[PDB]
C-alpha cells in the first residue's frame, strides 16, 4: 500500500547576496532535508541501505528542483531558494544562468502554478522520481519499480477523486517529468561549472553529491 496521506506528511514535515553562492548554499542545505523527506516516504527505509544511497544520489537533483519550483509558485517571475533569496530574471541573467532560468519558469514553475499542483501531487511526483528503477547498481530494480507503480497508482486515484472533472490531470502531472529530467541535467552542468572554476564555495554535502 502507498497512502498519499503520509506522502503529504513528508512534504509538510520538511518545509521551512551573490546568486551563485546562494544556489550552492541552498542545494547543500536542502540535501539534509531531502534525507529526512525520503525517510518519511513509505517503504523507502525498508529498502537496502545501498539502494537508498543509489536512489538519493540519482534523484537528489531533480528532487530539489521540483521542491523549489513548487515553492516558487507564489514568486512573480522568479525563483525562491531555500536560503530565503529570491532570484529573478535579472539576477539570474546577470549570473550567467538566464537561459536555464527561463526554462525553469516556463516548463516547471509556471506550469505548476497554472494547474494548481497541490503538495500531495508534488510529493507523489517526487516519490516517483525517488523510486527510479533506471538507477544503475540497484540490487533489485523490480522492487523499486513496484514501489513506483504503487505511488502513481495512489496519485491517479487521488486525482480522480480530488479532481474528477480533470480526467487528464494525472497524465499532465507525469508529463512534467521529462522537463524536470532535462532541466536537472542542465542545472547539474552549471553546478560543475560553479565547482570546477572554484569561483563558488561548495559545502560538504553538496560536494559529496558532485563527486563519485
Amino acid at each position: 500500500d502507498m497512502p498519499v496521506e503520509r506522502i503529504l506528511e513528508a512534504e509538510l514535515a520538511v518545509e521551512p547576496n551573490d546568486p551563485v553562492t546562494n544556489i550552492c548554499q541552498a542545494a547543500d542545505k536542502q540535501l539534509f532535508t531531502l534525507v529526512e523527506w525520503a525517510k518519511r516516504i513509505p517503504h523507502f527505509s525498508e529498502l537496502p541501505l545501498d539502494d537508498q544511497v543509489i536512489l538519493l544520489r540519482a534523484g537528489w537533483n531533480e528532487l530539489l528542483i521540483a521542491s523549489f519550483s513548487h515553492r516558487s509558485i507564489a514568486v512573480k517571475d522568479g525563483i525562491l531558494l531555500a536560503t530565503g533569496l529570491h532570484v529573478h530574471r535579472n539576477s539570474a541573467h546577470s549570473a550567467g544562468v538566464g537561459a536555464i532560468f527561463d526554462r525553469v519558469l516556463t516548463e516547471l514553475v509556471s506550469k505548476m502554478r497554472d494547474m494548481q499542483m497541490d503538495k500531495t501531487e508534488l510529493g507523489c511526483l517526487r516519490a516517483i522520481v525517488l523510486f527510479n528503477p533506471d538507477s544503475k547498481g540497484l540490487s533489485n530494480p523490480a522492487e523499486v519499480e513496484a514501489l513506483r507503480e504503487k505511488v502513481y497508482a495512489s496519485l491517479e486515484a487521488y486525482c480522480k477523486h480530488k479532481y474528477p472533472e480533470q480526467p487528464g490531470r494525472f497524465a499532465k502531472l507525469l508529463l512534467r517529468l521529462p522537463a524536470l529530467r532535462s532541466i536537472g541535467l542542465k542545472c547539474l552542468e552549471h553546478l560543475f561549472f560553479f565547482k570546477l572554476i572554484g569561483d563558488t564555495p561548495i559545502d560538504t554535502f553538496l560536494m559529496e553529491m558532485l563527486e563519485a
Binding site: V35, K39, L49, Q52, E208
Partner: peptide, 8 residues
C-alpha cells in the same frame, strides 16, 4: 559517507 550516516 555523510549520506550513509544521515540515512542511518
Amino acid at each position: 559517507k555523510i549520506l550513509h550516516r544521515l540515512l542511518q
